[PDB]
């Protein structure tokens, strides 16, 4: 047992490793979206940059779980980072819809980790999630939802002029 370990259940340690992997999976999905929107036959560079920034954010979320694991005396165990579910993302609306579902998947995993930490009576892990993860997820979900509403209003997927307008006034 690590000399620093105190009130840290093996189940929580394992779930933190799984959460780290999911953050990395999300980062990789966002990077795929960045690459898609940078294609010469897609060419929506403000949209591409939005997804690149989200890729960076998710990787930082992962690094923070690595640091957390070590601080508590757990051991980081890495697994393969699976490739994204799609190779091409259609258009800005389709990609934002996919991002919304990904953010809700991540949020559900965070909520499930919080349930586990509650069951094992780990207030440090609970507060870490509450103060460092759950509010940013809710903010990101709201932002992406707002974008989806606007893209539908702009006539996506059919209205290419609307798609151009979005790239030029909403993510600039």
**Contact of residue 153 among Mg ion, Co ion, Cl ion, none (CB under 5-8 Å per partner type):** none
| 45-84 binders of a copy of itself (CB under 8 A) | 45, 59, 63, 66-67, 69-73, 75-84
**How far is Cα 25 from Cα 21, in angstroms, rounded to an integer?**
6
Rg of the chain's alpha carbons, rounded to an integer? Answer: 18
| 86-145 binders of a copy of itself (CB under 8 A) | 87, 100, 104, 107-108, 111, 114-115, 121, 123-124, 126-131, 134-135, 138-139, 141-142, 145
| 2-61 binders of Mg ion (CB under 5 A) | 10
User: Could you check whether the bond before residue 157 is cis, i.e. omega within 30 degrees of 0?
Assistant: yes
Q: Nearest approach, Cβ of 140 to a copy of itself (angstroms)?
A: 10
| 70-129 binders of Co ion (CB under 5 A) | 103, 106, 127
Q: How many residues bind Co ion (CB under 5 A)?
A: 12
Q: How many helices (H) and strands (E) does the chain have?
A: 6, 0
Q: Which CA distances in Å does 115 have to 3, 12, 64, 73, 111?
A: 26, 10, 20, 21, 6
The answer to whether 42 contacts a copy of itself (rule: CB under 8 A) is yes
Which C-beta is closer to Cl ion: that of 105 or that of 118? 105
Question: Which candidate, 30, 148, 40, places its Cα nearest to that of 85?
Answer: 30
Numbered residues of the known binding site for Fe cation: 23, 58, 61, 103, 137, 140
């Amino acid at each position: 047992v690590s000399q620093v370990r105190q009130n840290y259940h093996s189940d929580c340690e394992a779930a933190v490793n799984r959460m780290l992997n999911l953050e990395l999976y999300a980062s990789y999905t966002y990077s795929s979206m960045y690459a898609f929107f940078d294609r010469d036959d897609v060419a929506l560079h403000n949209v591409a940059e939005f997804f690149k920034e989200h890729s960076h954010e998710e990787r930082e979320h992962a690094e923070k779980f690595m640091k957390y694991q070590n601080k508590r005396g757990g051991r980081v165990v890495l697994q393969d980072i699976k490739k994204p579910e799609r190779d091409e993302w259609g258009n800005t609306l389709e990609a934002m819809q996919a991002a919304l579902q990904l953010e809700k998947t991540v949020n559900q995993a965070l909520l499930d980790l919080h349930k586990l930490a509650t069951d094992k009576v780990d207030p440090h892990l609970c507060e870490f999630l509450e103060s460092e993860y759950l509010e940013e997820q809710v903010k990101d979900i709201k932002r992406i939802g707002d974008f989806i509403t606007n893209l539908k209003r702009l006539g996506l997927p059919e209205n290419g002029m609307g798609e151009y307008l979005f790239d030029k006034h909403s993510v600039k």
